[PDB]
Design a protein around this ligand. Structure first.
Ligand SMILES: [Ca+2]
Ligand SMILES: [Ca+2]
Ligand SMILES: [Ca+2]
Ligand SMILES: [Cl-]
Ligand code: NA
Ligand code: NA
Ligand code: NA
Lengths: 473, 5
């Protein structure tokens, strides 16, 4: 009979388990025997307190490096303001030691945990690449609670070295099964930011994770976008509980918050899932998340049923992670077929945007070719356009099965006249749909201003397979 | 910074 942790703050970890059902169903995974043994997670952040009483037992120097100072030791830099506490808080969410009379427990409290010290310094492209590419045959899962500025006017993503690190990781990492990159979708909610303007979250190679409050609401900091895949609990208003984890200076905190707390909880759940089936590929893991995540009782005004009967929201992706369901489905999972890529250049001429532009195109999705896709995974609309005030644009993409993805919502602070230069807006909302048929792109001016610009390129990029479908939900 | 926590 499984015995739950006795740690002093475990009763305050409301998001791990409870009678109430407002949790991530993590105790159910523990009771199936999965606690993370043998899985290696690295926190890419501002360092990790490797001697913390709730981390030392799980600490893994092979999962760690200091990119900022170019040494093996990721110890945080101690300051009066405790600026470099962030990575230690994230690490405890994944892998804080259980049943040791200290603080609470990690989701994967028997996993090995490391940290890359890379945020405490200039975060260049090379710095990101060296962190994302660290020991990729030892580290299984990388967790990143950072990214481009959430001011609601930035469009930015991985530069060349970092993107090369993503492709090398998913292609050759973890013995060719592919590194698992987990990303926090962003804190730009107050600025009406869109997490599709962040190339890290918008990447197909990352599992972008959003947040829900204890009472099941969209937190103030949350960013909505179509690239988000799923959700874990985090902080909300001051009547709602927060996240319990290891803090800097060997302390315990019950007030870890924001998007930063959601990605590590997802990384811990993915660690449990990898223990249940170490042969899962990076794409397998995303399929598992899509199939098992739970919308129920998460409040949003945009819940929609996609072409295969799954509920999807721009605030939550496919909903809350469910650790018990993840580890159960993982055990007899059949590896997905190799990923196909079908490139469809849509436009035959540039199109003036004006007040509203609609582009309709019927595609065959590479019918008759080895990259024929009947089972969609990610879809991208790679757009090149000029516009005088970027944040007045709203962009939607409708799949042949009728699923409307918001690629870009209005961003009031985005005054840029720089437009989009082949920006690969991504949606997860048509996962498992047949992409043959009519796709519709809509670009509209959401303001009364007399704005102007031109769409000069629209590449529809479809990823997926041609086999293995389930009967729709 | 180019990237934020
Ligand atoms: Ca160091
Ligand atoms: Ca503990
Ligand atoms: Ca953002
Ligand atoms: Cl590709
Ligand atoms: Na591979
Ligand atoms: Na992503
Ligand atoms: Na069709």
């Amino acid at each position: 009979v499984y015995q739950e942790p006795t740690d002093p703050k475990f009763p305050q970890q409301w998001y791990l388990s409870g009678v109430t059902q407002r949790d991530l169903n993590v105790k159910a995974a523990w009771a199936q025997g999965y606690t993370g043994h043998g899985i290696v997670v690295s926190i890419l952040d501002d360092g990790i307190e490797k001697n913390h009483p709730d981390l030392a037992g799980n600490y893994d120097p092979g999962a760690s490096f200091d990119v900022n100072d170019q040494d093996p030791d990721p110890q945080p830099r101690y300051t009066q303001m405790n600026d470099n506490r962030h990575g230690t808080r994230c690490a405890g969410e994944v892998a804080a030691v259980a049943n040791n009379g200290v603080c609470g427990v990690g989701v994967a409290y028997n996993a090995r945990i490391g940290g890359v010290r890379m945020l405490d310094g200039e975060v260049t492209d090379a710095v990101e690449a060296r962190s994302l590419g660290l020991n990729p045959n030892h580290i299984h899962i990388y967790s990143a609670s950072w990214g481009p500025e959430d001011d609601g006017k930035t469009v930015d993503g991985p530069a060349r070295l970092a993107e090369e690190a993503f492709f090398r990781g998913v292609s050759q990492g973890r013995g060719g099964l592919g590194s698992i990159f987990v990303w926090a979708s962003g804190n730009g909610g107050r600025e009406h930011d869109s997490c599709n303007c962040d190339g890290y979250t918008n990447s197909i190679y990352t599992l972008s994770i959003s947040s829900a409050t204890q009472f099941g609401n969209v937190p103030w900091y949350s960013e909505a976008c179509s690239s988000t895949l799923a959700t874990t609990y985090s902080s909300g208003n001051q009547n709602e509980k927060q996240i319990v984890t290891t803090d800097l200076r060997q302390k315990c905190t019950e007030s870890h918050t924001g998007t930063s707390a959601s990605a590590p909880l997802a990384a811990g759940i993915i660690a449990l899932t990898l223990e249940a089936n170490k042969n899962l590929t990076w794409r397998d893991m995303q399929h598992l998340v899509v199939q098992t995540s739970k919308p129920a009782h998460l409040n949003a005004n945009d819940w929609a049923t996609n072409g295969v009967g799954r509920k999807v929201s721009h605030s939550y992706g496919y909903g809350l992670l469910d650790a018990g369901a993840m580890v159960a489905l993982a055990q007899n999972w059949t590896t997905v077929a190799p990923q196909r890529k079908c490139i469809i250049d849509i436009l035959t001429e540039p199109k003036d945007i004006g007040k509203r532009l609609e582009v309709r195109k019927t595609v065959t999705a590479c019918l008759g070719e080895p990259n024929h896709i009947t089972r969609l995974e990610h879809a991208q609309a790679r757009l090149t356009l000029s516009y005088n005030r970027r944040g007045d644009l709203a962009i939607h993409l409708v799949s042949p099965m009728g699923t409307r993805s918001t690629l870009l919502a209005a961003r009031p602070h985005d005054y840029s006249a720089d437009g989009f230069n082949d920006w690969a807006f991504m949606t997860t909302h048509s996962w498992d749909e047949d992409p043959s048929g009519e796709w519709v792109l809509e670009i509209e001016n959401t303001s009364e201003a007399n704005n102007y610009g031109t769409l000069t390129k629209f590449t529809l990029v479809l990823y997926g397979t041609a086999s293995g479908s389930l009967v729709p939900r | 910074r180019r990237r934020k926590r």
